[PDB]
Paper text:
Factor H binding protein (fHbp) is a 27 kDa surface lipoprotein consisting of two β-barrels that promotes resistance against complement mediated lysis and is a key meningococcal antigen that elicits SBAs. We have shown previously that fH CCP 6 and 7 (fH67) are necessary for high affinity interactions with V1 fHbp, and that these two CCPs are sufficient to inhibit binding of full length fH to fHbp. Here we characterised members of the three variant families by identifying amino acids that are critical for fH binding and through structural analysis, to inform future vaccine design and to understand the basis of the interaction of fHbp with fH. Here we show that even though V1, 2 and V3 fHbps exhibit remarkably conserved atomic structures, differences in key amino acids necessary for interactions with fH are only revealed by functional studies.
To further understand the contribution of Pro106 to V3 fHbp:fH interactions (which markedly increases binding when changed to Ala), we also determined the structure of V3 fHbpP106A; with the exception of the change of the side chain, there was no significant alteration in the structure of V3 fHbpP106A compared with the wild-type protein, suggesting that the difference is due to a kinetic effect of the conformation in the loop containing this amino acid. For instance in V2 fHbp, mutation to Ala at position 157 increases binding by approximately five-fold, whilst mutation at position 106 increases the strength of binding by ∼100-fold in V3 fHbp. For instance, Ala substitution of Arg106 or the corresponding residue (i.e. Pro106 in V3 fHbp) reduces, does not affect, or increases interactions of fH with V1, V2 and V3 proteins respectively; our results with V2 fHbp are consistent with others showing no effect of this residue albeit by ELISA. Our findings illustrate differences in the precise mechanisms by which fH engages fHbp from different families, even though the same face of fHbp is involved. This is emphasised by the finding that Ala substitution of amino acids at the same position (i.e. V1 and V2 Arg106, and V3 Pro106) have profoundly different effects, markedly reducing, not affecting, or increasing fH affinity for V1, V2 and V3 fHbps, respectively. The dramatic increase in tightness of binding on mutating Pro to Ala at this position in V3 probably results from a kinetic effect, suggesting that in the unbound fHbp the loop containing this residue adopts a different conformation which must be refolded into the conformation seen in the complex. It may be that the Pro converts less readily to the structure required for binding than the loop bearing an Ala at this position Despite these distinctions, all amino acids from V1, V2, and V3 fHbps necessary for high affinity binding are located at the interface previously identified in the V1 fHbp:fH co-complex.
Residue numbers in the entry:
A (entry chain C): 84 to 124, 127 to 210, 212 to 320
B (entry chain B): 325 to 442
The structure:
Amino acid sequence: ALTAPLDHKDKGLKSLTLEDSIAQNGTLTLSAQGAEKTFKASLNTGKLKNDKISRFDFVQKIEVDGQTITLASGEFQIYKQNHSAVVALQIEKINNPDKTDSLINQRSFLVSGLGGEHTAFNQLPGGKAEYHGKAFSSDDPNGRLHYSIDFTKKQGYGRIEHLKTLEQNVELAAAELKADEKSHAVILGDTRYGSEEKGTYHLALFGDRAQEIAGSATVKIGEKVHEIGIAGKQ
Amino acid sequence: CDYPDIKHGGLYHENMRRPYFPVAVGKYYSYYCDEHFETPSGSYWDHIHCTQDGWSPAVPCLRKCYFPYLENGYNQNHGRKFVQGKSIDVACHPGYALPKAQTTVTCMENGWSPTPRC
């Protein structure tokens, strides 16, 4: 994925842009199995396995006064589907403010972005559709996504199951399906523990007939925000 | 709260989130800071919260200034990161000085003021 060019014979999604995963106009370097690739503000996803998380070691860098200073480092997680992908960053360490040429341990988990062929709001089929896939969080990669979209009613709802770090399934409450700035179909609503609101989720529809969904969700337990990467398919 | 105008930053997933504003009190979103800026926590990203008093943090992105190499100055502070509002004395070599009889540089929203040079 880090070295080879894009060929038609690869099982899609073939290519992914990492714009949102590059911070402070610097560079992102992904590495795995002795290989390496740097991205300046696509990843050949066609080589990666479908319906699975692919893990690369990452390093985010900036250039200041001649010196290439490491902003952060950790594990880059990408969940691949046919017409879509979800990217999450497990940050392990950040630049030491006192000694810029070194680092400090500071863990955080961010769903930084998506990729794929978005469904135009005018490509929505009639009736209903159901989606099944993954839900993944910080040290919790085996959650499950169940989601239903009523295209006529312009509404969706669902559930996140099996997240070790949560102890209750997350309800993805009834939410409106709108068109975004680029006329792509999107959904945004509340995440809950039964009827109790805990944060927000949002999904984008992917493929020429809304074959897939991909997005992110949040749950706030006390002051701790849990970010969750979500993706499903028909 | 309406769409947050994050000076020197922005929301992640902007496209998806934009159609659903305004949001209720208690809602929060992940945000990033641009080049030369950082969050109050010292990171490139954090969450911005819709409170009864509006968006929190009120200043989500703070300038960060890196002390530069000084030709004809002492480079003990070289490397070092300073946050918006912080100041530091400039130590020049004998026979050199900061212009206009200045003794310190401060990290302002637009960078070092004055420029640290001997």
